[PDB]
Amino acid sequence: VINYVEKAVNKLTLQMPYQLFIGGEFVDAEGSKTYNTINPTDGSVICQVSLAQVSDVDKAVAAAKEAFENGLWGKINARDRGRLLYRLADVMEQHQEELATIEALDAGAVYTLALKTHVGMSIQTFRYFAGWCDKIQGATIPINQARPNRNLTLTKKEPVGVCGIVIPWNYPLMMLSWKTAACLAAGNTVVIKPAQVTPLTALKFAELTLKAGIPKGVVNILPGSGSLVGQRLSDHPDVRKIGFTGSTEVGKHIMKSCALSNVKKVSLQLGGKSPLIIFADCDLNKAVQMGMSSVFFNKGENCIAAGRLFVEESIHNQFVQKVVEEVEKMKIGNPLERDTNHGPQNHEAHLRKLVEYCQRGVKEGATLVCGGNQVPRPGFFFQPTVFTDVEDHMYIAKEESFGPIMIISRFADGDVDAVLSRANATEFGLASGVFTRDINKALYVSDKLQAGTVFINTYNKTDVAAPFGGFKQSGFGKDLGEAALNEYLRIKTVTFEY
Amino acid sequence: VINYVEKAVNKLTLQMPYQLFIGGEFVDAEGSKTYNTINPTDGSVICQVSLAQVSDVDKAVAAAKEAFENGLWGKINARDRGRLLYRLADVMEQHQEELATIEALDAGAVYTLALKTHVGMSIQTFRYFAGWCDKIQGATIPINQARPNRNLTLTKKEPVGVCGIVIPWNYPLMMLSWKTAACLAAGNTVVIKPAQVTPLTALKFAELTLKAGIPKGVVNILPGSGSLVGQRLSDHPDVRKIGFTGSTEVGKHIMKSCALSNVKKVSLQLGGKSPLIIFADCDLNKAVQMGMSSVFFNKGENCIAAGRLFVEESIHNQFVQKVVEEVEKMKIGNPLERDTNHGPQNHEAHLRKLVEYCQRGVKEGATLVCGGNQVPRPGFFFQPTVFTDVEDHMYIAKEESFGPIMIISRFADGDVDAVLSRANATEFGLASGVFTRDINKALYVSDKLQAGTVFINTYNKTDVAAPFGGFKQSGFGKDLGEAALNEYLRIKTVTFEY
Amino acid sequence: VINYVEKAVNKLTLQMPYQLFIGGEFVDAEGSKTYNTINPTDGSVICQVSLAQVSDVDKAVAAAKEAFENGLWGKINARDRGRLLYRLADVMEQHQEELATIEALDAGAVYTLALKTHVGMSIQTFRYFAGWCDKIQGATIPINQARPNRNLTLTKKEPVGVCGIVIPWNYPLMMLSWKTAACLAAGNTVVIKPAQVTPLTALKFAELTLKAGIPKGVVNILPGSGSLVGQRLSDHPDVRKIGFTGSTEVGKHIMKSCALSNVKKVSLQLGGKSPLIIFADCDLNKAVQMGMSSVFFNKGENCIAAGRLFVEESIHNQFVQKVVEEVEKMKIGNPLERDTNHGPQNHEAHLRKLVEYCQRGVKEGATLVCGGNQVPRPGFFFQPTVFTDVEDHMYIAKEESFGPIMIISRFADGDVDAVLSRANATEFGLASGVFTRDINKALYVSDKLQAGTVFINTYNKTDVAAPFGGFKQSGFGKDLGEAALNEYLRIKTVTFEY
Amino acid sequence: VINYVEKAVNKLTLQMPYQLFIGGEFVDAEGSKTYNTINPTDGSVICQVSLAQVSDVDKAVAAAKEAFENGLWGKINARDRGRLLYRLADVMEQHQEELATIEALDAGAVYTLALKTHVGMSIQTFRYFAGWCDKIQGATIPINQARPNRNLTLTKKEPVGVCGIVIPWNYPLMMLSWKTAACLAAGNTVVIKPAQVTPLTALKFAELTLKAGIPKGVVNILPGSGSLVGQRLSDHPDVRKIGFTGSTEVGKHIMKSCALSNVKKVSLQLGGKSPLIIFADCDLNKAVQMGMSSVFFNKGENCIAAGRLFVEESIHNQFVQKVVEEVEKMKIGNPLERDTNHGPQNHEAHLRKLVEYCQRGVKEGATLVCGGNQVPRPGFFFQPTVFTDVEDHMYIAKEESFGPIMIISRFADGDVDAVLSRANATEFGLASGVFTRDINKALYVSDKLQAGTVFINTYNKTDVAAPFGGFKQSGFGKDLGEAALNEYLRIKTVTFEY
C-alpha cells in the first residue's frame, strides 16, 4: 500500500503519490528530503514531494538496467509488450477525471482542456505506440554475392537500453507520454525526470503502471532538481540515451556533458519563436479564431505557440479590432470551473517573467493594445495580451514569451519573400503557419519556412501519428509518428555466407 | 589549369593536386603553409600539401553554405542530382587505376586490393546513393480530423544543410565515399577533412567532381591538422552536422565541441575490439582463410578487424598450426607489385605503436607465436603477428591494435554463454563474427553479440546497401544502406485544414 | 432481440444465431428457406440455418455499399476505426469459451485447440490489424519540377470499397478473421460467405459486431450455397474485390467470372501439396514431433499441412518407427472431452474423399503402415494414416488430402538438388519446411523451395504479423502481416503545380 | 547481321529491324507471314513486319523461361542487373534521335515531342527502375516466440517469373518502357506484344537490348495480332503474369482467359473518361493553356486525356472564346516539321471512329464550336475539336474518344458537390484534374474524385517516380513509382525456430 496525499475536489477524492518511484515502489529520497509543489490557482502548497538525490538517480538507473537486462520486459514478445501498453492506456482512461484534476491543481490546466488534451492526448499516445510494438520491422537486403557462394543480409531493430528523459512543465502528463510511449514501445526502460514545478501527474502515472502490470523497473520517476537529476543522468555510464525538452540555458548547461564523455544518443527540443503569416486573402474570421488559439491555447504555455504574427497591411487593423473583441469574451477563472477559458500561468517565477517581458515590450516602443499584466486576483493569472507595431529588432520579436502574448507585425501587400525572410530570421525553427485561401501561396510558403512543422489554415493541430520536432536552434529528433521510434531503436546488421 | 605533382609510376602518369579545394578551385592555404606527405613504402616525401588554416575553414564553410542556399545544387531535380552523382561515379571509374595508385602511394594499399575495394567500392557507393536521390520519400499520415472540417498531414524530407565530415586514414577514398555519397545524395553540401597523413585521394577526388560537373562549393576539401580543422568545423555556427570517424582520444578531443555550440547533429564511429568466435563444428580450413582475412586484410588497418579470436579448445592447436602455415606464405613488399599481398603500415607513428603494442603483449605473458616486429626493409612494414594464450585481463585483449595482429584465446568445449560473456566484455561494439555449421548456435550467437554488425561464416563482408555502424563506445549512426540517408535528412511536417 | 438456438453443453448455455446477417440485423432468407448444419461428432442436426438467395446477396451488397458510401465507417477517423476493431477483439475474448464450443460442435475442432488457436488467433488478428488503421501511410515523392514552377506529388491510400470474402471450412472463425480483419482495418465493408458446412461461428461473430458497436452494414454474413452466393458476389457490379480461399474445382465455377464483366480485384488461395524435407543431420525426436504436427494438427484440415515428407535414407526407417509410436498414443474422441487430441473430420463428404483417397493410395502401390479408414464410431472420425514407399508419379504424391495422412518418400543420402527438384515438382506452392542442423543447407534449401512460406526446424508456426499466401497453382496475394493491407487499399496520386 | 529496313530520313539513315525477336535473335514468323505497317502522315506502307504465329508465342515463352530459370539474368547480383538496365538507358539515349524518328514515322508522334517525351521519358523510366534493383527489400518481423525456443521470421522479395505484356499504340516506346522497366528491374523476363499498328520502335528497342548486353531471352518481342498473341499468352501455363493496357473490348476477348486456366496475376488498364473541373477562381489564360494540353497533347491519343471539361458558368464563355483563339494558332502537319503542333492520328480505323464520334455528338444535340472532321490533306489528320452544350446523358459525355476533341459542360457557380457527382458518374476512374486558386476547393475536390490520379493546376504531369493506374472500370495495378515494383515481385516468408 502506497502513501498518498488525499484531497476532495472537483467531486472526487484524489489519491496522489508524492514519493520517488524506483523499481516498482514508492520510496523516500535519501535523508527524506522534500520540496513543496504549488497550486497556481491560489498560491497554496498542494503537498510535499520527495526531492531525489544523486544516490536515488543511481538506484533508478540500476533498477532500469536490471529490468532491461534480466527482467520480463526484455524477455516477452513484442505483441505482449504492446498489450501491456494498451492496458496502461485503458487504466489511464479509467482514471481520466482524476488525472485531469491533478493536472488542473498542479499545472493550472483548465479542466475541460486537460481532459480532452493533457489527458486525452496521452491516452491516444500510448494506444498509438502500443500498436507499433509488433510492427517494428527490419530489412532483408539484396547485397552482392560472394560467388560461387551465397549471402544473406538482414537487419534486426533492437532497443537501445536505459533512457533518461527530462519532461517540461507546460503539459506535464502529455509531454511525459510523448517521450515515454515511443521509448517503451521500442523495448527500452526508462528513468523520467518531471519538471520540478509539476511532478504530480507523473507520480500518479507511475502508480498507474503498477495497476497496468508493467514490470518493476521499466518505469522510474525522480521528482526533484533538474540540474541535479539531469546532470547525473547525463554522466551515467549505464544510460544509453537522453531525451531532453526544455530551455536552451537550462538546458544544455547540465547536459552539454552528454555525447561529451561515455557516449550517448541525445534528442533535443529547446524552444521556438514560431511565425504565423496571415495574408489578406485568408478567411478573416477563421484567422482571428485560429490566430488567437495559436497564442492563447493553454495560457500560451505551449512549445509551438505562434511567437510572432505577420499580418498583411490591408487587413491588419481589422484583424486587430477583431482579436480585441474576442479577447474581451475570454473568461478568466479557476481551472476547475466549467465556464473558465483561461487559467492561471503554471508557477510564479514564470508569471514574474511574463510581467517583465511586457514591461520590456513597452519600453522598446511596441504598442500595447491590451493586457500585459498580472490579473488582480489570487494565484498566478496573467492577462491575455496583444502588441502591435512590433519591429524585427525588438527583444519581443526574438524572445520566446511562453505565455499568452500575441505579438503582431505588419507586412506590405504582395510581399512574400520579404515576409518569409523576416519570418525565418529567428535562430529557432520549431513550428510555423500560414493562413491564405491561395493554393500557390500556401505551398510556396510551406517550402520556404524553416521549421519542423508548418500549419496551413489551422494551428496547434498536432497528432500522435504526425512527427513533431524542430530544426536550427530548436534542437532535432522527433516525438510522435513512426519517426519517433527510430530514436529509440538501434539497427544490427547480420550477414551470412553459405 | 590546376597545379599538379606529376609522377610516372605503375604504368601511368599520376597528376596529383596538393592544394585546398574550396568553391570549385584549388588554392593555397593562408600564408602558403604546407606539410609533407610521406610514402610508407620507402619513407620518402611524396609532396608538399597545403595546411588548412582557420580562415580557410571559414572560406570552405562559406562556399558550402552559398552552394546550398543559392547555388544550383539546391535548385535542380532530385533526379538530376542523381545523374550528377552517377556521372561522378563514372569519372571515378575512368580514373580507377590512377586513384588506386595514389592510394598505394599514399596509404600503402596493395594496388590490386585498392583497385577492387578502396576504389571499386567507392564507385559502387556513389552509384548506390545516386539511385536513392529520387526515391527519398516522405509520408501522408491519416491524422484525426477536426470535424466538420478535414485535415491532410504530410512529411517532406529535406537536406539538413552544410555538413562537415572527418575521414579516417585506413581507407582514405573509400571512407570518404562512404560518408559523402549519402550526404550529397540527400542534397547537402560538404566540407571534408581527410586525415592529415592521407590527403591525396581526397584531392584527386575533388578534381574529379569538377570533371563530373558538381557545382562549385558543393564539395570542399581541407587537408591539414585534424585538431585545427575539426575544432573549427565543430564550432562553426553554419555547419549543421558533423560526421566523425576516428579514435576516441584522439581524434575526438577536437570534434567534442558539437554539443554546447550552435547545436548540431553529430554521428560518431569511434573504434572496436570485435570478437570472432570459432566453434569446433565449423569448416576448419575456411575458418583459417576467413579468420586470417579478418585480421590481416589491408594490413589490419580496418575498423572492423577481429580484435580477438575465441577458438574452441578441441580445434585450437590445429587452427593455430594452420594459421602459421598460411602466414609463412604471405608476400610482404611494395604495394605496386603484383605479387605483394601485405603492404606497409600507413605511417611511421602507427608502425611505432604496433611494435610497442606487441612488446606489451609479450611482457604481460601472451605467447608470441610469430611476427612481433618491423620487417627489416625500407618503409613502414610490420610482421603479420599471432599471439596465443591471451587472457581476458590482458592489455592486448582490450586495446585495439589496428595492425595485423591476430589475438587468440581458447574457450572450453560446449560453453556458449561463457564465451559470449567474454566476447561482449569489451566497451566497444562495432563488429563481430561467428563460425559454425550449426544453425542454432549461429542464430543464437548473433542475437547475443552486442555489436552493430555480426558476420556468420564469413568476415569483412560489407556492402554499400548494408548499414554499418557501432553500438556502445563504438559510437552510433550508420553509414551505407538506406539507413544512412536519414542522418543527412530532416523531416518537415506539414498539416492543412480545409 | 435476436432468435437463438439454445444449447446447453460444455458447462455453458450457447446462444447461436442461425439467420442471414444483413444491414445489422438477423433476418430470414427469401421464402424462409433453410438447410441443416451437422455436428460431426455424432452426425446429428445441430439446427437449421437460413439459406441465402440471390435477392439476399443483393441486399447484403446494398447494405455494404451504403455503409461504405454514407454510413459512419466511411466518416470516422482511422484511429477510431482501430478502436472499434480492438473493442471487437475484446468482445471476442469475453466470448471465447463460447466461440470455441461452437467451433467444436460445428467443425469438430478439439475444444482446447479451438480455444488456443481457432479463437486465440482470431483475437490476435483483430488486435494486430486494429493497430494498423492509423499507420497506413501514403508518400510524398520528389518528381521532376516544371521549371520555373514547382510541383508537389503525394499518394493517398484509400479503401477499395465493398469486398466479398469466401471463407473455407477448416478453421471457420480463424480464416474468417484472417481474411477480414485486414479488409476492415483498411476501411472497407464486407459481404462474407462462410462455408455452407460451417456457418455457426460466423453468425455468432456477426452478433459480436453489434456488441462492439461496429456500424450497421459494415459486416454482412450470408450462409448458404457456395455456388449461389459466390457466383452472385462475383458478378455484382458494386463489389470491387473478391477474396477467395477454397479448392480449385470449386472455385473455378463460383469465383471464376470475376474478370468476365465489371472488373474486380481478386485474391486466391487454392490449395497446396507442401513438402517437408527431413535431413539425416536434424534433431530426430524434434523432427518426429514436428512432422507429426505438420500432418495431424487440426485433424489434417489445415491449408499448410505437409502433404509429402521426404526423409533422408539413413534415418528413414528409424523415423517411421518413431512416428508409429507417436500415432499409437493419439487419443481419438469427442472434441469436448479434455483428453481428446484427434477429433472428427469436419463433415461427411470430406470423410468420403479421405476414404477414396486412401483406397487409391493402396491401389497404386504405396505401403499403408497404418490407418486409412473411417473409425468405427458414430460421426465422421478418420484413423490417423501413415503411407511409406510413396513414389513421385503416384496420385497421393500429387493430390492434396486435407486429412490426417502422412505421405512419406525416401531420398538418397547427401543429395540436395535432387530432392529439391522432387519437392518442387508439385503444381502447388503454398508452404514447405526443412529440418536440418546445417545452416548452409537450411539457407540454401529455403532459397530453392518454390513456396510462399518456408519453415526451418519448425512447422505450422504462422503468426498474425507474418504474411501467408502461395505461389504457382496455390494462387497469390497475402493474408496476415502488413502486406495483407495492400490487397485492400488503392493508391491515389495527387500532383500539384504551383 | 540483323536484317534492316533502311530509310534515309530526318537527316538519318534509319535501320529498322522488322522480324520477331525471340531468344536474342530476330527471326521470321512461322510460314514467313507478314503484314504491313502504315505511315499515318501519307498513308504509305513503311515495310512488311513479321506476323507472330501460335508456335512463335510458345517459342518466346520458352526462351523467357529458360532465360529466367537457367540463364545469367537469374544468377547475377541485383546491383549488376541495375547496371545492365542503366546501360540500356544509355544506349537508348545514344539512339534517341533515331528512336524518335521511328516513332514519328510509325505512330505519327511529332518529332520534337517524341524526343522530349516518347523517348525522353522511356530513358528516364529505365534509369529510375535501374536504381531500384538493389533497393528492393524484404523484412524481419517480430513474431511471437515459441518459448522456451526462439523464432526468426523474414520475408524475401523475389521475381514472379515469365511475364507477358501487351502494349497500347498511343505511345509505343513509352508504354513499353513503363510496362517493362519495372518488370525487368524486379528480375523477371518478358514477352512483349506491341500493338499491331505500331511495332517499329519495339523492335528497334529489342536491338538495343543486344547492344546493352541484356542476356538472350530476357526480352522477347512478338509483333502481330492482338487476339492471337494475347490469347496464347493468357493460356500459357508458363506465364505467371499478364500486364494488359488497351480497350475493354478488345481486351477481354483476349486477356480474359487468365482466371479460367493455370492461375496468373493480371494488371489491367482499360480506358478513361477523365474529368477536368475548371473553377471561376483559377488563372484563366493558364487554364486555357493547360486545358488545351489536357485534350490535344499527342493528338489526344493519351490514356489520361481529359474527356470532359466542366467549366464554371461565369467563365464558360470567355474560356471557350480563348480556347478558340488558341486552336486557330495550332500548326498541323508532318510530324517531322519542327513547327508542327498537331500530328496525324495513329492509323486509319481510328481516324474513321473519330469522324463517327463527332457526328454522333452533333446528332444527340451538342454544339460543335470547331473542328469535327478529317483535315483534308494526305494521311489521317483530324481537326482539333471543341464541343459545348454537352449534357451528362449524351454518348460523348460517356465514351472515350481518344482523339483531339475538347468536350465541355457548364456547372453552376459555387456548386462543388454537384460538379463532383457529375465528374464521378463515369464508369472509368483513370485520371482527373481541378484548376482553382482556392486551396480548400483543391484539397476537397482531390479527396472526392474517384480517380487514380488527380492533377491540381496542371495536367499530363506524369513522372517516372509517381504511381499511375486507375480505379473502377479503368482497371487496377500501377505502372511507375515504387508501387509498380510490387506487381512484379512475390513475397516468401521464411520462419526458423532455434
Do both C358 and C331 map to the same domain?
yes
Kindly state the cell numbers that stand for B52: 588548412
Do both B107 and B235 map to the same domain?
yes
**β-bridge pairing A189-193 and C431-435:** unpaired
Q: C1 in a domain, yes or no?
A: no
Which amino acid type is present at position B30? Answer: E
**Which method was it determined by?**
X-ray
Q: Which of B136, B145, B456 sits opposite C142 (nearest CB)?
A: B136
Q: A1 in a domain, yes or no?
A: no
* Closest chain A residue to B153, measured at CA: A466
D11: left (phi over 0), alpha (psi -120 to 50) or beta: left
Kindly state the cell numbers that stand for D119: 523517348
**β-bridge pairing A431-435 and A453-456:** parallel
Which amino acid type is present at position A14? Answer: L
Q: How many CB atoms lie within 10 A of CB C493?
A: 28
With a CB cutoff of 8 Å and minimum separation 6, the contacts of D356 are none
Which amino acid type is present at position A256? Answer: K
Find chains touching chain D: ≥3 CB pairs under 8 Å. A, B, C
A365: left (phi over 0), alpha (psi -120 to 50) or beta: left
* Closest chain B residue to C77, measured at CA: B144
Which amino acid type is present at position A460? Answer: N
How many helices and strands (H and E) does chain D possess?
A: 15, 22
Q: C363 in a domain, yes or no?
A: yes
Q: Which CATH number fits the domain that encloses residue C283? A: 3.40.309.10
**Which whole-number Å values give the CA distances from C34 to C28, C40, C224, C253, D380, in the listed order?**
8, 19, 8, 23, 64
Q: Give contacts of B146 with chain A, Cβ < 8 Å.
A: 458, 461
Closest CA to D332 of D69, D78, D108, D72: D108
Q: Do D140 and A144 touch (CB under 8 A)?
A: no
Residues composing chain C: 498
Show contacts of A332-337: CB within 8 Å, 24+ apart. A332/A375, A332/A381, A332/A383, A332/A384, A334/A41, A335/A41, A335/A104, A335/A108, A335/A109, A335/A110, A335/A111, A335/A114, A336/A9, A336/A10, A336/A41, A336/A101, A336/A104, A336/A111
Chains B, D: CB contacts within 8 A come to: 53
Q: At what angle do helices A78-94 and A172-185 cross, to 10 degrees?
A: 160
Q: Give contacts of D155 with chain C, Cβ < 8 Å.
A: 467, 483
CA gap A137, A124 in Å, rounded: 22
Q: Which CATH number fits the domain that encloses residue A198? A: 3.40.605.10
Q: Do D79 and B482 touch (CB under 8 A)?
A: no
Q: Give contacts of D456 with chain C, Cβ < 8 Å.
A: 494-497
Closest CA to A423 of A457, A389, A446, A395: A446
CA gap D195, D172 in Å, rounded: 8
Do both A469 and A439 map to the same domain?
no
For A38, the 3-state DSSP assignment is: strand
Kindly state the cell numbers that stand for B428: 566497444
Q: C418 in a domain, yes or no?
A: yes
Q: How many CB atoms lie within 10 A of CB A291?
A: 26
With a CB cutoff of 8 Å and minimum separation 6, the contacts of C480 are C125, C178, C182, C462, C463, C464, C465, C466, C467, C468
Q: D329 in a domain, yes or no?
A: yes
- Per DSSP, which regions of A235-390 are E strands? 239-245, 265-269, 274-278, 306-312, 367-370, 385-388
Burial of A285 (0-12, 13-18, 19+ CB in 10 A): exposed
B6: left (phi over 0), alpha (psi -120 to 50) or beta: beta
Residues B327/B371, Cβ–Cβ less than 8 Å: yes
Closest CA to A247 of A7, A424, A428, A118: A428
Q: Do B140 and C144 touch (CB under 8 A)?
A: no
With a CB cutoff of 8 Å and minimum separation 6, the contacts of A63 are A22, A23, A24, A216, A217, A220
Closest CA to D226 of D256, D195, D252, D247: D195
CA gap C477, D2 in Å, rounded: 42
Do both C486 and C451 map to the same domain?
no
Distance of CA B391 to the CA centre of its chain: 29
* Closest chain C residue to D473, measured at CA: C263
Q: Which of D78, D140, D157 sits opposite A137 (nearest CB)?
A: D140
Residues C192/C202, Cβ–Cβ less than 8 Å: yes
Q: Which of D152, D444, D465 sits opposite B498 (nearest CB)?
A: D444
Q: How many CB atoms lie within 10 A of CB B444?
A: 18
Residues D177/D121, Cβ–Cβ less than 8 Å: yes
Residues D266/D239, Cβ–Cβ less than 8 Å: no
**From the CA of C378, how many Å to the nearest CA of chain A?**
42
**Which whole-number Å values give the CA distances from B83 to A213, C114, C149, D99, in the listed order?**
55, 58, 21, 22
Residues D405/D395, Cβ–Cβ less than 8 Å: no
Kindly state the cell numbers that stand for B135: 526515391
Residues D459/D307, Cβ–Cβ less than 8 Å: no
Q: How many CB atoms lie within 10 A of CB C253?
A: 12
Which amino acid type is present at position B464? Answer: V
With a CB cutoff of 8 Å and minimum separation 6, the contacts of B17 are B2, B3, B4, B26, B203, B204, B206, B207
Residues B336/B9, Cβ–Cβ less than 8 Å: yes
Q: Which residue has the cell 610482421?
A: B383
What SS3 string covers A54-116? Answer: HHHHHHHHHHHHHHHHCCHHHCCCHHHHHHHHHHHHHHHHHCHHHHHHHHHHHHCCCHHHHHH
Distance of CA D196 to the CA centre of its chain: 15
Q: Give contacts of A454 with chain B, Cβ < 8 Å.
A: 492-495
Kindly state the cell numbers that stand for B356: 610497442
Number of domains in chain C: 2
CA gap A419, B234 in Å, rounded: 32
Q: Do B465 and D79 touch (CB under 8 A)?
A: yes
If residue C103 lies in a helix (H) or strand (E), which one and from where to where?
helix C96-107
Residues C279/C244, Cβ–Cβ less than 8 Å: no
**Which whole-number Å values give the CA distances from C246 to B497, C170, C270, C425, C471, in the listed order?**
46, 10, 5, 22, 15
**From the CA of C241, how many Å to the nearest CA of chain A?**
26
Closest CA to B234 of B290, B286, B163, B175: B163
Q: What are the φ and ψ backbone dihedral angles of D494, each rounded to 5 degrees? A: -125, 125
**Which whole-number Å values give the CA distances from A129 to A177, A268, B494, C127, in the listed order?**
10, 20, 21, 14
CA gap B93, B122 in Å, rounded: 9
Distance of CA B166 to the CA centre of its chain: 10
Closest CA to B284 of B238, B333, B317, B328: B317
Find chains touching chain A: ≥3 CB pairs under 8 Å. B, C, D
**From the CA of B135, how many Å to the nearest CA of chain C?**
7
Find chains touching chain B: ≥3 CB pairs under 8 Å. A, C, D
Resolution, in Å, please?
2.4
Q: Which of A82, A83, A444 sits opposite C498 (nearest CB)?
A: A444
Burial of C287 (0-12, 13-18, 19+ CB in 10 A): buried
Do both A484 and A394 map to the same domain?
no
With a CB cutoff of 8 Å and minimum separation 6, the contacts of B138 are B154, B155, B156, B157, B491, C139, C140
- Which of A432, A494, A498 is best to mutate for the B interface (most B CBs within 10 A)? A494
Q: Which of B132, B443, B498 sits opposite D152 (nearest CB)?
A: B443
Q: How many CB atoms lie within 10 A of CB B24?
A: 18
Q: Give contacts of B144 with chain C, Cβ < 8 Å.
A: 77, 79
If residue B14 lies in a helix (H) or strand (E), which one and from where to where?
strand B12-16
If residue C193 lies in a helix (H) or strand (E), which one and from where to where?
strand C189-193
Do both A404 and A316 map to the same domain?
yes
**From the CA of A263, how many Å to the nearest CA of chain D?**
28
CA gap C404, D433 in Å, rounded: 58
**Which whole-number Å values give the CA distances from C486 to A32, A54, C154, C360, D492, in the listed order?**
58, 52, 17, 42, 16
Q: Do C145 and B440 touch (CB under 8 A)?
A: no
Alpha helix stretches (DSSP H) within C267-377: 284-296, 313-328, 348-364
**Which whole-number Å values give the CA distances from A214 to A81, A205, A399, in the listed order?**
9, 12, 42
Do both A143 and A292 map to the same domain?
no
Residues D496/C457, Cβ–Cβ less than 8 Å: yes
Q: How many CB atoms lie within 10 A of CB A425?
A: 14
Beta bridge partner(s), residue A141: A153
Do both A163 and A217 map to the same domain?
yes
Closest CA to A169 of A43, A416, A350: A350
Do both B364 and B260 map to the same domain?
no
Do both B181 and B312 map to the same domain?
no
CA gap A84, A209 in Å, rounded: 9
With a CB cutoff of 8 Å and minimum separation 6, the contacts of B178 are B125, B468, B479, B480
Residues B292/B306, Cβ–Cβ less than 8 Å: no
CA gap B247, B268 in Å, rounded: 10
CA gap B164, B236 in Å, rounded: 10
Q: Which residue has the cell 517525351?
A: D117
Cα separation of the two ends of chain A: 58
Do both A232 and A292 map to the same domain?
no
Q: Please, what is the Cα angle at C492 between C488 and C498, to 5 degrees?
A: 160
Closest CA to D496 of D152, D235, D252: D152
A12: left (phi over 0), alpha (psi -120 to 50) or beta: beta
CA gap D188, D238 in Å, rounded: 13
CA gap C400, C398 in Å, rounded: 7
Q: D319 in a domain, yes or no?
A: yes
With a CB cutoff of 8 Å and minimum separation 6, the contacts of C379 are C39, C40, C41, C42, C43, C108, C344
CA gap C244, C270 in Å, rounded: 8
**What is the sign, positive or negative, of the torsion defined by CA atoms of C11, C12, C13, C17?**
negative
Structural Rg of chain C based on CA atoms: 24
- Per DSSP, which regions of B256-379 are E strands? 265-269, 274-278, 306-312, 367-370
Q: A160 lies in which domain range?
A: 6-271+464-498
**From the CA of C301, how many Å to the nearest CA of chain A?**
27
Kindly state the cell numbers that stand for D62: 520458352
Do both C314 and C244 map to the same domain?
no
